[PDB]
Structure 1
């Protein structure tokens, strides 16, 4: 027998455990409290919440599956988040370290906001490195597994120990090549070289050996028959996977010889101009399976996307069977198994093919459209 002089009924307040590091205090909020207000009361009742400027801190609901933890939006109210008495929010630092592979082999570490999408972080990353054309850029895990620009790193399963790659994804505008800025020249070189080498830029066997000849001149200096003889080369470092044939060593060394005493800068300039001169340059290819009239077996075929068109290309000859301008495409739709283009009245029938790349294809087509729309308003 003992009543409680402190008993208060009809209290309709969220009783939440606030977590900051080793510390866990319990605090009371009115459910309709804006999140930016909850952070404010946290800062006024727990001194460990003053360890950094407010803009660096947020409320975070954790989860056994890290991809499912969420940062609460400043503009919402606690009850939007179906909070029940006894739940924990962490008042948590928003900045995480992120490792991007640098051109000199080092890895720069950039602080990025764990609460923002990959689109937003790309501005941060390019500014900290000094890239101007950031809407042409994207990220891949070091390990063409492009990440999703409309989702955070956390919700795609990218862990903080992972090192990421900054690569050019869209080919909308090309600055001129200038031997007077060797740093910029080396960028354009490294970008064209990696695309040839990894197979993003398909090239003939003959051409793949000509690039390799330039790459030899750039990495070893003028050809030296004494040191650059049979067996010298690690072909996987100099040829696309498709191109690796020991017939190539002799062919690469010839091209290397034909450079004579070309300087490393002239070789880089000649490498970039050659790549830019191929009709494959700036085209993203995807492997799809078409259906022919009659033929119940599907034909493998390449789908090429550019800043101007979508293209049906032959898997071997690389010649363009058919090309549709992006302005002739009314809508598209992807599935985990298919990709489909609607052309409106420009054609009788949809274009539909099997591919595991439907979503990647759609993201490329939509990204080019978004660059085009952004460039049309900014020229008005």
Structure 2
């Protein structure tokens, strides 16, 4: 009724007899009394390990369990193996530190050990991330992480303001979809540079961190990532440099950065109309974007989205629509009406009237 188990240590294999109820912690002691190789380091740096052809499936025995918890049988082998191994962690400043960690611990337990060595007490404001997602309640080993891999130390993201809250993913996703769709469909006009910035975050959100082997030329369908007017361009390299610049940023940080970026623009929350300006004495017309808000009218370059002129709504003296044009009269504020060619004049006139009313 004794269990006869082969103990492997280095190149030694010695069969020892154990009662099936022997606690692992006592079994380790027993081994340390009999094989000098077992004394290579302190007891807490070693344990018993059952290997598997799949390295992911080898398991460390728990000190406080009995051997028979593990269903051990006569002729099985247990390895008395060092738990401590060196793990490369990327710090926040980009440098890489090599820290001794216990292979039998969960990611969470290691992270606590890691933080304490570098002087961080709030270990739960951090997570570890892999270099090509880790459950922090499982071990690195069982998740297929190989010992030569570097992990990154990443601070959990928190941001909130009057507009967005990183703690409420549902609401955040509503605001992100709205801002993104308005940008993709041209409702919110943006420069090419800003479109490509937005699309970098979009890539981060849809694909995760940039992967140079997979996220290569011709990977994106640019019609899904840029306003139409920018598809006829070399946008992909610009988008991927923005994507890359996101590093290991979480999906929620990326959404928050997208929404804040959209709200920072002069053009955000403005109702836009695509109109044309007549050029005196010439046939050409010049496209322009005309924007209206509760506080102002803006004249915006159709290409660059620069605001080239702006007026307060309180400066309008009168305004007039016809079936082909729309005209603003600013009276003594400036010399000359602003008139534009458009078939949407009634609708512009109506938006203005509504704002002036209040």
CA offset at residue 31 of structure 1?
102
CA offset at residue 127 of structure 1?
50
CA offset at residue 217 of structure 1?
1.1
Task: Measure the CA separation in 1 of the matches of 2:324 and 2:38.
Answer: 48
> How has the CA–CA distance of structure 1 residues 219 and 63 changed in structure 2, closer, same or farther, with 3 Å as cutoff?
closer
In structure 2, list runs of 5 or more residues that go unmatched. none
Q: SS at the partner of 1:31?
A: coil
Does residue 1:92 correspond to 2:78, yes or no?
A: no
CA offset at residue 214 of structure 1?
0.4
CA offset at residue 216 of structure 1?
1.0
Structure 1, 112-121 or 255-264: larger mean CA deviation? 112-121
Pairing 1:1-380 to 2, within 5 Å after superposition: 175-245=162-232, 247-295=234-282, 297-347=284-334, 349-369=336-356
CA offset at residue 229 of structure 1?
2.5
Question: Are 1:137 and 1:170, in contact at CA under 8 Å, matched by a contact in 2?
Answer: no
Task: Measure the CA separation in 1 of the matches of 2:46 and 2:111.
Answer: 20
CA offset at residue 267 of structure 1?
0.3
Task: Measure the CA separation in 2 of the matches of 1:362 and 1:167.
Answer: 52
| TM-score, length-scaled by structure 2 | 0.50
> How has the CA–CA distance of structure 1 residues 188 and 83 changed in structure 2, closer, same or farther, with 3 Å as cutoff?
farther
Question: Are 2:159 and 2:166, in contact at CA under 8 Å, matched by a contact in 1?
Answer: no
> How has the CA–CA distance of structure 1 residues 285 and 237 changed in structure 2, closer, same or farther, with 3 Å as cutoff?
same
Q: What CA deviation, in whole Å up to 9, does each residue of 1:142-181 have, x standing for no partner? A: 9xxx999999999999999999999999999994222122
Q: SS at the partner of 2:33?
A: helix
Task: Measure the CA separation in 1 of the matches of 2:116 and 2:296.
Answer: 30
Task: Measure the CA separation in 1 of the matches of 2:356 and 2:2.
Answer: 48
Question: Are 2:2 and 2:19, in contact at CA under 8 Å, matched by a contact in 1?
Answer: yes
Question: Are 1:171 and 1:307, in contact at CA under 8 Å, matched by a contact in 2?
Answer: no
> How has the CA–CA distance of structure 1 residues 221 and 120 changed in structure 2, closer, same or farther, with 3 Å as cutoff?
closer
User: Quick check: which has more Rg, 1 or 2?
Assistant: 2
> How has the CA–CA distance of structure 1 residues 288 and 332 changed in structure 2, closer, same or farther, with 3 Å as cutoff?
same
How many pairs align? 356
Task: Measure the CA separation in 2 of the matches of 1:174 and 1:331.
Answer: 38
CA offset at residue 17 of structure 1?
100
> How has the CA–CA distance of structure 1 residues 225 and 330 changed in structure 2, closer, same or farther, with 3 Å as cutoff?
same
> How has the CA–CA distance of structure 1 residues 49 and 261 changed in structure 2, closer, same or farther, with 3 Å as cutoff?
closer
Q: SS at the partner of 2:171?
A: helix
Structure 1, 65-74 or 233-242: larger mean CA deviation? 65-74
Task: Measure the CA separation in 2 of the matches of 1:112 and 1:333.
Answer: 75
Task: Measure the CA separation in 1 of the matches of 2:246 and 2:319.
Answer: 47
> How has the CA–CA distance of structure 1 residues 51 and 336 changed in structure 2, closer, same or farther, with 3 Å as cutoff?
farther
> How has the CA–CA distance of structure 1 residues 248 and 368 changed in structure 2, closer, same or farther, with 3 Å as cutoff?
same
CA offset at residue 284 of structure 1?
2.6
> How has the CA–CA distance of structure 1 residues 42 and 178 changed in structure 2, closer, same or farther, with 3 Å as cutoff?
same
CA offset at residue 280 of structure 1?
2.3
Task: Measure the CA separation in 1 of the matches of 2:341 and 2:79.
Answer: 45
> How has the CA–CA distance of structure 1 residues 179 and 307 changed in structure 2, closer, same or farther, with 3 Å as cutoff?
same
CA offset at residue 274 of structure 1?
1.2
Structure 1, 26-35 or 175-184: larger mean CA deviation? 26-35
Q: What CA deviation, in whole Å up to 9, does each residue of 1:91-118 have, x standing for no partner? A: 9999999999999999999999999999
Question: Are 1:138 and 1:168, in contact at CA under 8 Å, matched by a contact in 2?
Answer: yes
In structure 1, list runs of 5 or more residues that go unmatched. 1-11, 371-380
CA offset at residue 197 of structure 1?
0.6
> How has the CA–CA distance of structure 1 residues 20 and 328 changed in structure 2, closer, same or farther, with 3 Å as cutoff?
farther
Question: Are 2:296 and 2:311, in contact at CA under 8 Å, matched by a contact in 1?
Answer: yes
> How has the CA–CA distance of structure 1 residues 24 and 221 changed in structure 2, closer, same or farther, with 3 Å as cutoff?
closer
Question: Are 2:160 and 2:166, in contact at CA under 8 Å, matched by a contact in 1?
Answer: no
Question: Are 1:170 and 1:368, in contact at CA under 8 Å, matched by a contact in 2?
Answer: no
Task: Measure the CA separation in 2 of the matches of 1:164 and 1:356.
Answer: 59
Task: Measure the CA separation in 2 of the matches of 1:17 and 1:117.
Answer: 28
CA offset at residue 264 of structure 1?
0.8
Question: Are 1:310 and 1:324, in contact at CA under 8 Å, matched by a contact in 2?
Answer: yes
